[PDB]
RNA sequence: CACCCCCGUGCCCAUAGCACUGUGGAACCACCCCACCCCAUGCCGAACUGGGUCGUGAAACACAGCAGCGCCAAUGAUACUCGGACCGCAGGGUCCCGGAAAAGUCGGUCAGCGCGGGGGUU
């Protein structure tokens, strides 16, 4: 007549989102300290002028113009040139 | 650099690589020889290291040749597609306008640009 269950899903679940992607692009300002990469690994590698916290953030380290360096795939690099 | 060549070291990060192949030796490089100590081997001077030859340039390196491989790669057309409009009950499909691949064919290529030093041009 009618049905009992009993079925479910295992699934669901799921992770809170991680904003990720660079946040400073091609040719932008940027103030001592600005975030301009958050990644998984080591996709943008740092250049002159940024570092790299733990998280392989990428952060300025002295203001100026962002410039990005692709080298050929799978090794990038994204820098800081001062306007001047 | 005056011309060559070699040694280091770079920008370049494969149209710059690999194989097959030829050339190279006291002038740079290499193997070489010795090691009780500096120094070093999870064992061994193989490697790091130390004292230095001759000998060999065979190995390795440098250079030249080469298109077998690798890599780079058209135009043409197409896929798809912003945006204008449409058909099909629906799965799906069309027209106009611009953008426009990938794979493949044509091919292209045994790289190029520097710095310093050494050593040669009866
Ligand atoms: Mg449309
Ligand atoms: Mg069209
Ligand atoms: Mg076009
Ligand atoms: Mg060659």
Redesign the pocket.
């Known amino acids: 007549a009618h049905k009992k269950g009993v079925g479910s899903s295992k699934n669901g679940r799921d992770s809170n989102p991680k904003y990720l992607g660079v946040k400073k692009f091609g040719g932008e300002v940027v103030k001592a300290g600005n975030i301009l990469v958050r990644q998984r690994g080591t996709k943008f590698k740092a250049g002159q002028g940024v570092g790299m916290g733990r998280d392989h953030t990428l952060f300025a380290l002295s203001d100026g113009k962002v410039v990005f360096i692709n ?3 799978g ?1 990038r690099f994204i820098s800081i040139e001062a306007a001047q």
């Open positions: 080298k050929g795939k090794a």
